[PDB]
């Protein structure tokens, strides 16, 4: 009944784990990074990293490890998902195609038992004789790794302990040995066992049971020369190996906690350690040589090494370059020096990697007043927390825009000898060519008396060797520039008007009638060299330097009008090489072949907007990949701009979209402009990196920003942002943030770092007089701050200090009552460490004047303020399982009217028309009606069978949507039945779905300009952005049929069936998908190969790729 759709906007960015080893070959050094559901592979070079492969799994990755069984060159990978899918995979590079096969499969789920804290742990034998797993408490799963057992059969072993923290297999033992740390009454211990897979029981470890300091959570297994283990905690680094015992207690640790490690020395002499707030460490293992026995160590030494972000995963790579893996902030790549610079730091960074992190809140804001808003989020954390301005497409920066009608061509020229940046531009209206002169910001007209002024030409610019070119239907001619006059004249010896020509930088190719004249532009004179009539008509040409040649192109390309085809053909003698046919019949209007990387591309832009591809190489020119794609309706020309050393081509279509190649694939990033026709570069001194461009009636020039689809501009604040609001008439933003602060011995607390929270241009402090009622000498406290940020320059114009320790929760800007003024309104809650439930809060309303910040009214509120929204002209709030409505009087006051206190922890809240959806923490969605006549709340419908919601919104006036903490979606619906006595307070779950992620905020709006109904965006903890919309009957039925015919055949990496994962799940309750369409699958239809699409349903293929296309652009 309820027909919906969910798709991906931006893949997650947080990093959950990273390891190194040997996938690509035995002599490569790989870096493996695991996202939420994404795996990516990096191989090491001398300057940094490089990507090779990207894969997605139908499950949440929880275990990732490398191992080397006997009798093969490289390692093997073991992965265990969140629904306990167990797999063995490995790396196959066969030719150029890369694929990863499943040399095993299985499911290790049980019937009775409880998933526990600390999640899943997966370890592997140093001799690779089994694989251990902790899944449920008190029960340890062992996988045998004999040559048989393709199905990953397992077996169970009972444990005398139920609470396991960490587990690793020891080094240099006779038979597979386990040593691990567990939790029980009377502290935590480390204690060891021996397995016997023949008789399936734990026998005895090599040494006895001892004790460890109360909060160790981190175990390192020492390699062969020393053996034993390293135990890391707070004020403890320890070594155990049989009987020998040693430890150190460095005084540095007190303030911060260690997180990750990676062994630096294969021998095991130095170690890397990652801190909870940035300082990377180094640990020292000092060894002695016995006179006759094996090596042994004396002691342990630490040293403060440098500064980094917060680390989640940490790997010493080699030669003093180290990856820092961050989940709460930007990850970076670091170089360690041999000599410490000033302040004594060895660290030098080379790259940084952006991470939206936990998207706490967001709003949709439209800056430049067009029909396209942009999203601003509250990203990052304690020391990296910033503001991100996520913009779809690149923003233009216009300088000289004039409404100039349609322009066929527009060229530059150089009026001086071959000096620096050009000084002239050449126009061309509908049927002639006009020459300008560009002496600065002004525009002027001056016709040179050496050119034509009444008839259109194809080429006007220069190639080389102090001369000018004249390419025309009526004549071909060359121009001398010192006289600025004419040197010679030529005409076509057929009196026939040319169709098209071609020349970029060294030679002209002109195509007349069925034949084609040729001459490369010689100094001061010209002679025919090459000539060959084409069997059928010629439509387009392309001549360009492709590499080690100063303009002279060995090859030539030819386009065709009626039945589109490319012909690889030599320039010098115009001999045929190959024939290759292309689809469609609609008319082309340009083709280009251009270099970006070692794999050359030729790109043809067709008349429907569809952009097609054939392959070209200078030596032979065999056909590379091929795929049917479409675009905007208006016909398209591609011609190239200059951006970088690997600069790329632009295009003209319905709406300008610049294609970009990142590693080897073409990215389809758009840009914010209405329509375009034609281009050329301008590199003036005052216009350093601009482009001259023609439109239907407009001229646009500007500057070029980034290349990939999403523009992020990081604005550092050193602030932990919470929520954000807009107030347009005030020409600014309102942002909440909150600061890390330690109490000093003097009672008062000063600071830890300089922050915008205290570095405000002007500041003010809350001055309440209604709170009146213990902090220690050294401890952590938290201070909260309102930030007004200039909407144009993104600088802190002002910052307001809330009271000490007031934990501010909510923000809104609206007009209330009959007041014409716009305000900033905050709901807060004085949180206490000792108690457990907020008893109070204030509702402060702010006037932000010309440059000052005023305060109006307080009206203390008897509890926390989880959510608010202006109802119609009233103020609707949610306070501690209550919902309330408020009125704005004329005398600048606020009064209560009607209450409702049946719920428990009514937290999320949305309104539509005259109905209220109150989301809940634990019970369910629930609906209210505001009844105007006598004026209070009256329940319409509810929902039983409780769920733990994490976001709630109103899709339409009749169905309702929520999201819950077990990573699932569901669209509720009203039941249309009679007997309205009790079952009309019952709402109907109609859709079921396993999203896989945690949803933090829902918002109406769309990140696109100005097939389905409704539009919604949400942001997740892992930094993903998702979108949901409703559907009608026909596309739903079609697409679910297609979903069956696609998930029946598609191969998961662990060959899990696609139905199982997308299926709804919960601790207590599980059913397959219904009511929903999966965008992940549907837009995954495009990576499928052409033949295998004819073994797709085969009532055709194009009719459905058009469907997936139209559903794609909604995000």
């Amino acid at each position: 009944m309820s027909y919906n759709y969910v798709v991906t906007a931006q893949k997650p960015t947080a990093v959950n784990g990273c390891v190194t080893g040997h996938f690509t070959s035995a002599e490569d050094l790989n870096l493996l990074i695991a996202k939420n559901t994404r795996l990516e592979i990096y191989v090491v070079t001398a300057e940094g990293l490089r990507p090779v492969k990207e894969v997605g799994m139908y499950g949440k990755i929880a275990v990732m490890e490398l191992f080397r069984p006997k009798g093969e060159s490289k390692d093997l990978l073991f992965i265990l998902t969140a629904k306990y899918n167990a797999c063995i995979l490995e790396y196959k590079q066969s030719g150029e195609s890369i694929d990863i096969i499943t040399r095993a499969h299985g499911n290790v789920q049980d019937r009775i038992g409880r998933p526990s804290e600390t999640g899943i742990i997966g370890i592997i034998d140093p001799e690779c004789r089994m694989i251990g797993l902790r899944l449920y408490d008190g029960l340890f799963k062992v996988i045998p790794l004999d040559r048989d057992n393709k199905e990953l059969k397992a077996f169970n072993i009972r444990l005398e302990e139920l609470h396991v923290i960490d587990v690793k297999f020891l080094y240099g033992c006779q038979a597979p040995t386990i040593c691990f740390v567990y939790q029980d009454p009377q502290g935590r211990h480390v204690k060891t066992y021996e397995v016997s897979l023949r008789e399936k029981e734990f026998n005895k470890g090599p040494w006895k049971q001892e004790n460890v300091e109360a909060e160790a959570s981190m175990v390192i297994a020492v390699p062969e020369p020393f053996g034993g283990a390293i135990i890391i905690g707070q004020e403890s680094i320890t070594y155990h190996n049989g009987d020998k015992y040693l430890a150190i207690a460095p005084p540095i640790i007190k303030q911060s906690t260690i997180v990750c490690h990676n062994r630096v020395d294969p021998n095991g002499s130095r170690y890397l350690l990652g801190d909870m707030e940035g300082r990377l460490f180094m640990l020292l293992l000092e060894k002695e040589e016995q006179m006759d026995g094996t090596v042994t160590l004396k002691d342990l030494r630490v040293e403060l090494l440098g500064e980094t972000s917060i680390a989640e995963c940490l790997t010493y790579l080699d030669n003093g370059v180290v990856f820092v893996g961050s989940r709460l902030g930007d990850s970076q790549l670091v170089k360690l020096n041999v000599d410490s610079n000033e302040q004594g730091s060895y660290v030098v960074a080379m790259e940084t990697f952006t991470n939206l992190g936990p998207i706490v809140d967001m709003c949709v804001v439209d800056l430049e007043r067009q029909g396209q808003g942009q999203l601003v989020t509250c990203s990052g954390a304690f020391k990296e927390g910033s503001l991100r301005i996520i913009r779809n497409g690149i923003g233009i920066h216009e300088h000289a825009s004039i409404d100039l009608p349609g322009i066929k061509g527009l060229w530059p020229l150089r009026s001086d000898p071959n000096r620096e940046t050009d000084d002239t531009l050449v126009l061309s209206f509908v049927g002639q060519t006009r020459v300008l002169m560009l002496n600065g910001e002004e525009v002027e007209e001056t016709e040179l008396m050496g050119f034509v002024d009444d008839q259109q030409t194809f080429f006007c610019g220069n190639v080389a060797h102090q001369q000018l070119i004249q390419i025309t239907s009526a004549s071909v001619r060359l121009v001398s520039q010192e006289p600025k006059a004419l040197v010679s004249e030529w005409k076509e010896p057929q009196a026939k008007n040319i169709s098209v020509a071609s020349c970029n930088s060294s030679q002209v190719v002109v195509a007349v009638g069925r034949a084609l004249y040729y001459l490369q532009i010689h100094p001061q004179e010209l002679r025919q060299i090459s000539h060959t009539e084409m069997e059928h008509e010629v439509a387009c040409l392309d001549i360009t330097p492709l590499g080690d040649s100063n303009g002279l192109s060995p090859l030539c390309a030819i386009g065709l009008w009626t039945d589109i085809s490319a012909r690889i053909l030599k320039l010098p003698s115009f001999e045929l090489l190959h024939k290759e046919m292309l689809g469609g019949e609609i008319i082309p209007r340009s083709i280009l072949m251009t270099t970006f990387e070692s794999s050359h591309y030729l790109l043809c832009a067709l008349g429907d907007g569809a952009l097609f591809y054939f392959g070209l190489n200078i030596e032979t020119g065999l056909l590379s990949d091929r795929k049917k794609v479409t675009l905007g309706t208006q016909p398209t020309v591609l011609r190239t701009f200059r951006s970088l050393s690997t600069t790329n081509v632009f295009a003209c279509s319905d709406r300008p979209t610049v294609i970009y190649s990142s590693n080897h694939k073409l990215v389809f990033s758009n840009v914010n402009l209405k329509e375009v026709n034609y281009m050329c570069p301008l590199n003036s001194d005052g216009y350093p990196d601009s482009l001259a461009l023609a439109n239907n009636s407009t001229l646009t020039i500007g500057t070029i920003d980034e290349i990939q689809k999403l523009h992020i501009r990081t604005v550092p604040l050193y602030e932990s942002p919470r929520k954000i609001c807009y107030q347009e008439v005030s020409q600014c933003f309102g942002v909440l943030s909150s600061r890390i602060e330690v109490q000093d011995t003097s009672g008062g607390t000063t600071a830890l770092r300089p922050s915008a929270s205290t570095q405000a241009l002007s500041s003010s402090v809350s001055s309440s007089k209604l709170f009146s009622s213990e902090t220690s000498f050294g401890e952590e406290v938290e201070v909260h701050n309102l930030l007004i940020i200039d909407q144009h320059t993104f600088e802190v114009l002002h910052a307001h200090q809330f009271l000490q320790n007031e934990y501010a929760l909510s923000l809104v800007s609206c007009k209330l009552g009959k007041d014409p003024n716009t305000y900033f309104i905050v709901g807060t809650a004085m949180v206490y460490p000792e108690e457990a439930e907020p008893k109070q809060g204030r509702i402060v309303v702010f006037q932000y004047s010309d440059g000052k910040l005023q305060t109006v009214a307080e009206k203390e509120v008897k509890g926390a303020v989880y959510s608010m929204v202006e109802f119609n002209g009233k103020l609707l709030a949610s306070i501690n399982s209550t919902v309330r409505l408020y009125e704005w009087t004329t005398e600048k006051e606020l009064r209560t009217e009607c209450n409702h206190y049946n719920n428990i922890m009514a937290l999320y809240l949305k309104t539509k028309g005259d109905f209220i959806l109150v989301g809940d923490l634990m019970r369910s969605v629930l609906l209210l009606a505001y009844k105007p006549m006598e004026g209070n709340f009256e329940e319409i419908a509810r929902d039983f069978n409780p769920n733990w919601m994490s976001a709630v919104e109103i899709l339409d006036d009749d169905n309702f949507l929520g999201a819950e903490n077990a990573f699932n979606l569901f669209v509720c619906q009203k039941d249309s039945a009679a007997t309205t006595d009790e079952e009309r307070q019952h709402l109907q779950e109609v859709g079921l779905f396993h999203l896989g992620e945690f949803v933090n905020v829902f918002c109406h709006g769309s990140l696109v300009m100005q097939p389905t109904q409704g539009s919604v965006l949400f942001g997740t903890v892992n930094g993903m952005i998702g979108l949901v919309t409703s559907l009608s009957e026909s596309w739903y039925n079609l697409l679910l049929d297609m979903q069956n015919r696609l998930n029946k055949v598609i191969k998961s990496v662990g060959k899990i069936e696609h139905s199982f994962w997308r299926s709804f799940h919960t601790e207590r309750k599980t059913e397959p998908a219904t009511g929903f369409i999966d965008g992940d699958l549907i837009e995954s239809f495009l990576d499928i190969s052409r033949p295998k699409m004819q073994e797709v349903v085969a009532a055709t293929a194009d009719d459905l790729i058009k469907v997936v296309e139209e559903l794609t652009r909604i995000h």
Binding site: A14, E117, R327, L328, P358, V360, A381, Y807, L809, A829, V831, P833, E835, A836, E837, P838, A864, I904, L921, M922, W948, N965, F998, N1000, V1021, N1022
Partner: peptide, 26 residues
């Protein structure tokens, strides 16, 4: 065990207290 910042941790993705604990507490 204090609600506002345990929900804050859940928003940030830090290990929050288990839902069964809230079930017992509610």
């Amino acid at each position: 065990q204090i609600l506002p910042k345990v929900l804050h941790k859940r928003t940030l993705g830090l290990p929050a207290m288990s839902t069964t604990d809230l079930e017992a507490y509610f």
